[PDB]
DNA sequence: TTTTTTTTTTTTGAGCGACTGCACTACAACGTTGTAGTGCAGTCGCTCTTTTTT
């Protein structure tokens, strides 16, 4: 490998950057981005400068892409300022300014990059794949709109259940017995094959033939057993082997156990006494007959139906899942990669790759250790060897810890074998040089510490600015790495975990007890800082040991937080308390639910309070009244107003904040309230939200929004964090109590050392088990390097002679089977004294060891402080007056028109029929039939309706007898919308008396009550028309449900006007028409131009009665001026 | 077409592998007897990671 300079890197072809842990990878990416933008490098530069929309940056994590986009924007702005000023304070910016000759063109290009920074092509992998699938949809064959699903486990379980239905149901008893012996149901099969159903389907080594079913394999194994049974029945009754001292004389009893075994071939499990009939075991305890060799050949391979069922499941479930996702039209995260790989797999899609070479002629791929083989196949299809396009794989093989997710280091090894150039970052800017020297000493004990040839380790160099970092104790300067070797010969798992958790808690309380007195310090040069509880962090791997650490730390009065806690908030007691409270609010009549909800910990009442509440009837009546008020608020205002009124009236938030340990409960209550308010807007019914809350209580599924948050941020807590959640973070002091605990992989799923393909071995071959255990040990070594390279000042290790084997004292320990002991014991099996000598061999100034001391003196000291006085400002007046833009409604034989259905929708249909129809032209029956087809009414009503319309049109509506046919198109105006202002507070008592002073219809009609309305009033007049130089108004009322006879005279219409209070509407219409004719027509008189207002009841118009149906009214011409003066001011 | 009423939970780990004790034969020392290796049976620890992508 070679060293990497960001200003001398040739951006041609494929380059492989190996950025170590703690190095400035994001700074090197920003430097290369500025280099690609400005076109710097000279001979090693790009042939042409590129824009922002041509630089493709690929990073997996979305927050990492957002941080990189913000950092690149800040670097662009800083370089633009430094180019406008021709000076800077950074040496890399100084060399960047020294590399360019021109300043004005570079400043203009940086200004255009700052303006085009919003359209930057810095996306994720799946986002880039979705964008390329949606952009060039023709060559790929992708839909334009698709629905991404977050959870795929439901369809996978459905396809597994369908496979178990179509495969395990028609089996006979002799096969279903073996199927039940292999798996209890489809859940066990799904639990077995869930690591192979997702992602790329692996290639099965030595697959069964396509014509072999379960019955053929069962008959083959039955015949194989029956041949051995026949050979035992033929050669029975003889004994010719020599009797040995190990061979007891009870073997004939084992032959009797083999005498009762040959009865039927309905079973599947042979006897263990056949292990006594092996020639390789009898020779070690002279076998000449081939019956023993046939028994050994029968027991050479396990008789199992498991591999054929697993192959049929892997052939069926994935196909059913793909068919279901093609039917529903949905897509997944890996489905975008599979669609892009299938598009590039075709012949025309290669030209599509050239389109990608037309789109972005560069690629900088960050985090190349988390690369699927489909992703690298795509990136090799696009950017293998084409000119003028560059590929920059910036990654780290020592951080590939996501093999459980789908990543694979063999893809990185294939990429390293394919590319030619390698570059590495030498400087480390995070940790102290003592920790750097400890890491370079521990991992360089032997050659190829990661046990693979393509993953080399290089000694990194510490920073010059961080060479004075010292974690000092009361005695002297504490060393960097302190391997706490637990003393003993052999120990178990739980006892070792408990002892190391107690030792870690004792070290935490010793660092915190001496840290609050100014003894233990972090010193940078001469500056010092006391060690708080947030500096010490325990790095664990599993949830059980994290709970063990938390229980061993909370015993010594030390609070600790769990950063890797992914538990749902709906699985706590507070969700059940909120459910009980909502059930008491919804049904407050039954006292049982209210009594069960009042006694919860959210209310916080004693047993004496509950007894006095059951005894006193008046207090329970007050409780029922306030819960009915809460139900009224919940039905009128929603969820969060009811919850806030409940938390303010009961004052339970102050009581939960006063109680120690109730702040997390209060934050959980607030998050449950926020989720209930978020789910309550999408539901109309009130019980539906309660059923949704009970379902989400019964469903412990984890979503990104429904997870538990951090309870507090100001108070420092000991942060327990897993190794996978600590990648890229930073911690001052790190404790690793369970770094020696290891787990042996049992399944045979490995990768070939030549083809680099996933090989799944269904047979229990030892070579596949060893090749899987080698990859497991490499993953454990990578996890060890990740957990080791996160400390800055001090790291502590827990070493112990852990034995995974069940024997207590066997003379050897299994530390060589772990990751730490492979570096301590140099990959050799030793003893506890050998482990101690290997620990004491590598003793430097940075690496020390001490024995594990079990002992506690005192938990802690609280040292609490008082809280200052604080108050809240109060608003003096009301926030606003009653300003609202409202309307009039806000201030308030077989076929006949009498038999018309009375409703709002038929009223609007008749209003639209009278609006759309022309009054001059005769009514056409086909137009009425088309309008009834568009509306959806009956077709039989059409020939009666049109003649009724003509009966309406033949009836004149005027004091002189003017019909509607005499009105031209310019004279009419339909649906005039007006806005009327009013600046005074509209008093109902001052208005109703002014109406009753002039209007004769206000003799009855007691006055309506409304608030003071100041602002605007909307109105929609139906028709305004002029005739012989006089303006007239026309409105339509068509409900008229209660009349079928000719009783709709002027008295009944006046009674309807007094009941529905249309007098105010007609008076406002006259005022609006008067103001309109005053504003429009100059020299306007109200008595000269206005003629009256006509109300047209549609169901009251008769052919013989011209007066019935119409209602003409004229004001007194004195109410209009007073109403205008009142509305004006 | 009308109408009657009711308050009680319960269950749930099992195969893998060692520890220990008894019994039975092989074999050598003193026909009979003591020690060792192996098999069978009851009892008990233990144990089942990590996470994020529009």
UniProtKB/Swiss-Prot annotation:
GO terms for molecular function: 3'-5' DNA helicase activity; ATP binding; ATP hydrolysis activity; ATP-dependent activity, acting on DNA; DNA binding; DNA endonuclease activity; DNA helicase activity; DNA translocase activity. Mg(2+) binds at residues 911, 1022, 1035-1036. Residues 882-1129 are annotated as: Nuclease activity, interacts with RecD and RecA. Keywords: ATP-binding, DNA damage, DNA repair, DNA-binding, Exonuclease, Helicase, Hydrolase, Isomerase, Magnesium, Metal-binding, Nuclease, Nucleotide-binding. Residues 248-250, 493-494, 542-543, 743 bind DNA. One of its GO terms (biological process) is response to radiation. Disruption phenotype: Decreased degradation of DNA with free ends that is unable to undergo homologous recombination, which can fortuitously lead to more efficient viral infection. Cells are deficient in DNA recombination repair and have increased sensitivity to UV light. The cultures have many inviable cells. Cells cannot be transformed with retron Ec48-containing plasmids. It comes from the Bacteria. It catalyses: Exonucleolytic cleavage (in the presence of ATP) in either 5'- to 3'- or 3'- to 5'-direction to yield 5'-phosphooligonucleotides; Couples ATP hydrolysis with the unwinding of duplex DNA by translocating in the 3'-5' direction; ATP + H2O = ADP + phosphate + H(+). The keyword Cell inner membrane does not apply. The N-terminal DNA-binding domain (residues 1-929) is a ssDNA-dependent ATPase and has ATP-dependent 3'-5' helicase function; both are stimulated in the presence of RecC, suggesting this domain interacts with RecC. Holoenzyme reconstituted with this RecB N-terminal fragment has no nuclease activity. The C-terminal domain (residues 928-1180) has weak ssDNA endonuclease activity as an isolated fragment. RecD probably interacts with this domain. The C-terminal domain interacts with RecA, facilitating its loading onto ssDNA. Interaction is decreased by ATP. The holoenzyme may undergo conformational shifts upon DNA binding: the nuclease domain of RecB may swing away from the DNA exit tunnel in RecC. When Chi DNA binds to the RecC tunnel, the nuclease domain may then swing back to its original position (that seen in crystal structures), allowing it to nick the DNA 3' of the Chi site and then rotate to load RecA. At high Mg(2+) the nuclease domain may swing back more frequently, explaining differences seen in assays performed at high Mg(2+). In the RecBCD complex, RecB has a slow 3'-5' helicase, an exonuclease activity and loads RecA onto ssDNA, RecD has a fast 5'-3' helicase activity while RecC stimulates the ATPase and processivity of the RecB helicase and contributes to recognition of the Chi site. Heterotrimer of RecB, RecC and RecD. All subunits contribute to DNA-binding. The C-terminus interacts with RecA. Interacts with YgbT (Cas1). (Microbial infection) Lambda virus GamS protein interacts with the enzyme without displacing any of the subunits. Belongs to the helicase family. UvrD subfamily. This is RecBCD enzyme subunit RecB. It comes from Escherichia coli (strain K12). The gene is recB.
């Amino acid at each position: 490998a070679e060293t990497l300079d960001p200003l001398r890197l040739p951006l041609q072809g494929e380059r492989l950057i190996e950025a170590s842990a703690g190095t400035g990878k994001t700074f090197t990416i920003a430097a290369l981005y500025l280099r690609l933008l400005l076109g710097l490098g000279g001979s090693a530069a790009f042939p042409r400068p590129l824009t922002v929309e041509e630089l493709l940056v690929v990073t997996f994590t979305e927050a990492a892409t957002a941080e990189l986009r913000g950092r690149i924007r800040s670097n662009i702005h800083e370089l633009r300022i430094a180019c406008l000023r021709e000076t800077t304070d950074n040496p890399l910016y100084e060399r960047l300014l020294e590399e360019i000759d021109d300043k004005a063109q570079a400043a203009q290009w940086l200004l255009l990059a700052e303006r085009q920074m919003d359209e930057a092509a810095v996306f994720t992998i799946h986002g880039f794949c979705q964008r390329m699938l949606n952009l060039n949809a023709f060559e790929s064959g992708m839909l334009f709109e698709q629905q991404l699903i977050e959870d795929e486990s439901l369809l996978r379980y459905q396809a597994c259940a369908d496979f178990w239905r179509r495969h395990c149901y028609p089996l006979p008893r002799e096969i279903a017995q073996v199927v039940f012996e292999t798996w209890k149901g489809p859940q066990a099969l799904l639990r077995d094959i869930n690591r192979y159903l997702q992602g790329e389907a692996p290639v099965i080594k030595a697959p069964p033939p396509d014509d072999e079913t379960l019955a053929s394999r069962h008959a083959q194994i039955v015949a194989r057993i029956d041949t051995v049974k026949q050979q035992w029945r033929d050669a029975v009754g003889e004994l010719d082997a020599l009797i040995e001292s190990s061979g007891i004389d009870r073997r004939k009893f084992n032959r009797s156990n083999q005498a009762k075994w040959i009865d039927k071939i309905s079973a599947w499990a042979e006897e263990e006494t056949n292990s006594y009939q092996l020639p390789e075991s009898l020779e070690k305890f002279t076998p000449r007959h081939p019956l023993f060799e046939a028994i050994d050949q029968l027991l050479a391979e396990p008789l199992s139906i498991r591999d054929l069922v697993i192959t049929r499941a892997l052939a069926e479930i994935r196909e059913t899942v793909a068919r279901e996702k093609r039917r529903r039209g949905e897509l997944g995260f890996d489905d975008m990669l599979s669609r892009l790989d299938s598009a590039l797999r075709s012949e025309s899609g290669e030209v599509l790759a050239a389109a990608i070479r037309t789109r972005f002629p560069v690629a900088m791929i960050d985090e190349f250790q988390d690369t699927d083989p489909q992703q690298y196949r795509i990136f090799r299809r696009i950017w293998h060897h084409q000119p003028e396009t560059a590929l920059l794989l910036i990654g780290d093989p020592k951080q590939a810890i996501y093999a459980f997710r789908g990543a694979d280091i063999f893809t990185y090894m294939k990429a390293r074998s394919e590319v030619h150039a390698h570059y590495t970052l030498d400087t480390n800017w995070r940790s102290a040089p003592g920790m750097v020297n400890s890491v370079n000493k521990l991992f360089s004990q032997t050659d190829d510490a990661f046990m693979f040839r393509e993953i080399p380790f290089i000694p990194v160099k510490s920073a010059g600015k961080n060479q004075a970092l010292r974690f000092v104790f009361k005695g002297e300067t504490q060393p960097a790495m302190k391997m706490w070797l637990m003393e003993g010969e052999s120990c178990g798992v739980g006892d070792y975990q408990s002892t190391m958790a107690q030792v870690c808690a004792a070290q935490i309380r010793d660092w915190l007890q001496a840290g609050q007195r100014g003894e233990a310090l972090l010193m940078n040069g001469d500056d010092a800082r006391p060690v708080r509880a947030s500096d010490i962090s325990v790095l664990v791997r599993s949830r059980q040991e994290a709970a063990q650490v938390r229980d061993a730390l909370t015993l010594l009065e030390i609070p600790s937080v769990y950063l890797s806690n992914r538990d749902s908030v709906f699985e706590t007691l507070e969700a059940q308390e909120m459910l009980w409270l909502l059930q008491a609010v919804m049904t407050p009549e039954r006292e049982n639910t209210l009594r069960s909800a009042l006694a919860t910990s959210m209310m916080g009442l004693n047993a004496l309070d509950i007894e006095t509440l059951n005894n006193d009837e008046h207090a329970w009546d007050v409780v029922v009244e306030e819960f009915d008020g809460y139900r009224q608020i919940w039905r009128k205002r929603g969820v969060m107003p009811m919850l806030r009124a409940l938390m303010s009236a009961r004052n339970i938030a102050e009581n939960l904040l006063a109680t120690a340990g109730g702040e997390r409960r209060l934050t959980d209550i607030l998050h449950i309230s926020e989720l209930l308010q978020e789910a309550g807007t999408q539901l109309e019914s009130e019980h539906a939200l309660v059923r949704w809350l009970s379902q989400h209580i019964l469903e412990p599924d984890s979503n990104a929004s429904s997870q538990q948050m951090r309870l507090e941020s100001d108070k420092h807590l000991v942060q327990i964090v897993t190794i996978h959640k600590s990648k890229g973070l930073e911690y001052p002091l790190v404790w690793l109590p369970f770094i020696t605990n290891f787990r042996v992989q049992e399944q045979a799923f490995y990768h070939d050392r030549h083809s680099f393909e996933a090989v799944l071995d269904l047979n229990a071959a030892p070579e596949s088990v060893d090749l899987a255990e080698a990859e497991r040990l490499a993953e454990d070594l990578r996890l060890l390097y990740v957990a080791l390279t996160r400390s800055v000042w001090h790291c502590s290790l827990g070493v112990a002679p852990l034995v995974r084997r069940r024997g207590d004292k066997k003379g050897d320990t299994d530390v060589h089977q772990s990751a730490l002991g492979r570096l301590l014991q140099k990959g050799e099996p030793q003893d506890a004294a050998g482990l101690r000598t290997c620990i004491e061999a590598l003793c430097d100034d940075d690496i020390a060891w001490q024995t594990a001391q079990t002992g506690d003196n005192q938990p802690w000291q609280v040292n609490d402080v008082s809280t200052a006085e604080l108050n809240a400002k109060t608003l003096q007046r009301l926030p606003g007056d009653n300003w609202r833009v409202t309307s009039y409604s806000g201030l308030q034989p077989t076929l006949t028109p009498h038999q018309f259905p009375r409703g709002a929708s038929p009223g609007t249909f008749l209003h639209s029929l009278f609006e759309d129809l022309d009054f001059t032209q005769p009514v056409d029956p086909n137009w009425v039939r088309e309008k009834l087809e568009l509306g959806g009414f009956e077709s039989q009503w059409e020939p009666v309706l049109t003649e009724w319309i003509t009966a309406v049109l033949q009836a004149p509506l005027n004091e002189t007898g003017v019909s509607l046919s005499q009105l031209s198109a310019r004279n009419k105006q339909v649906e005039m919308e007006f806005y009327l202002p009013i600046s005074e507070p509209l008093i109902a008592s001052q208005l109703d008396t002014l109406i009753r002073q002039f209007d004769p219809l206000s003799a009855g009609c007691p006055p309506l009550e409304f608030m003071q309305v100041r602002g605007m009033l909307k109105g929609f007049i139906d028709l305004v028309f002029r005739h012989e130089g006089r303006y007239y108004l026309l409105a339509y009322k068509s409900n008229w449900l209660g009349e079928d006879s000719s009783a709709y005279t002027q008295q009944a219409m006046a009674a309807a006007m007094q009941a529905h209070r249309y007098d105010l509407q007609y008076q406002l219409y006259t005022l609006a028409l008067h103001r309109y004719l005053r504003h429009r027509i100059a020299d306007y008189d109200y008595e000269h131009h206005f003629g009256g207002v006509i109300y047209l009841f549609l169901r009251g118009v008769d052919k013989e009665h011209p007066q019935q149906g119409i209602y003409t009214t004229r004001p007194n011409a004195g109410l209009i001026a007073l109403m205008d003066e009142m509305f004006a001011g």
